[PDB]
């Protein structure tokens, strides 16, 4: 019902942060939330907003497509918990692996100097200063774009700059008030 | 030297190696010796061709991090201490020293002025990093990091222990220096 749903989920998501119990927590959440209605952009959008203060329409989009892995244009119940997994409780793996997908705006492997503009001032003249740095201070082939490998591979060794694309995750102050609503920690 | 690392290990608050691992440093010590005592220079050249450091300022830091008695000397005791902490600390140990080595003027905060040299060393650039290292970091919002501020981040986000310079060894030099030095 609500608790046989939670066992097909901890058994079958690659969600890795939650117990079972955990996830019953965010299955009635989803629920009371929709209450048979399908999340859509419009809803995922204000919960980013409300709850999570994100305020980009950009950002925000950029989140949305992230949690939909399947692109159906809907978050299912799977993709709320996975996605909730890694933007709560996230390794610092995860967090890039979604950062980068977050930021790679074409889906090509790489981000782009424009794309790097582009999500750093909706993140946020020291924008373009700042992606300068970025793909200076990372890769060994210097061709004016960074692949999976020099993003991830690089930041290990400047953390601030994880910390400005870094605002596709949500603030200390945000998870703590929904793991503390919602999951009870 | 066997006395001398009996005697070593004895008074040493070093907290990672055992006596034999001891030894081997002080046989270490004595084998990059180039005058009678370890100064900047030699220090600067560990630093470079086996940690792989090459921004002056970070090193500058770290030879005085090591050096507690401020002499200008890393004496056998804290060539023993330092390393101990920088290849093997906690993270509490680790937190202290990188503390430390970033607040440059040793009054007890890293200030917004001490946080631009550091990422210096594209202006805008640079001011926006530390808009964004206190806006994570300053808990006490003082715009300026205590030790509180600093450590309470780093607990909470440990990619943050380094966040304004490698003051630190990579893993691979860590492990290259561990071999030929201890012996994995
Ligand atoms: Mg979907
Ligand atoms: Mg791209
Ligand atoms: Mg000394
Ligand atoms: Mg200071
Ligand atoms: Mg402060």
Redesign the interface.
């Known amino acids: 019902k609500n608790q046989k749903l939670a066992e097909e989920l901890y058994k079958t998501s690659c969600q890795k942060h939650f117990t079972k119990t955990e996830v019953e927590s965010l299955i009635i959440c989803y629920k009371n939330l929709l209450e048979g209605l399908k999340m859509d952009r419009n809803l995922f959008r204000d919960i980013l907003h409300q709850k999570f203060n994100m305020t980009e329409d950009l950002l925000m989009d950029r989140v949305f497509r992230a949690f939909d892995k399947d692109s159906d244009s809907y978050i299912s119940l799977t993709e709320w918990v996975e996605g909730l997994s890694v933007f709560l409780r996230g390794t610092?793996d995860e967090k890039m692996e979604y950062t980068f997908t977050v930021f790679d705006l074409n889906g090509d492997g790489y981000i782009s100097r424009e794309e790097m503009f582009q999500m750093l001032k909706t993140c946020?003249?020291?924008?373009?200063?700042?992606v300068?740095?970025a793909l200076k201070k990372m890769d060994h082939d210097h061709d004016s774009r960074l692949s999976k490998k020099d993003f991830k591979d690089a930041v290990l060794?400047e953390?601030?700059?994880?910390?400005?694309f870094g605002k596709c995750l949500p603030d200390?102050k945000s998870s703590e008030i929904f793991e503390y609503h919602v999951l009870g920690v």
Do not use: C, R, T, Y
């Open positions: 610092l946020l003249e020291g924008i373009k200063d700042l300068e740095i060794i953390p601030l700059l994880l910390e400005a200390e």
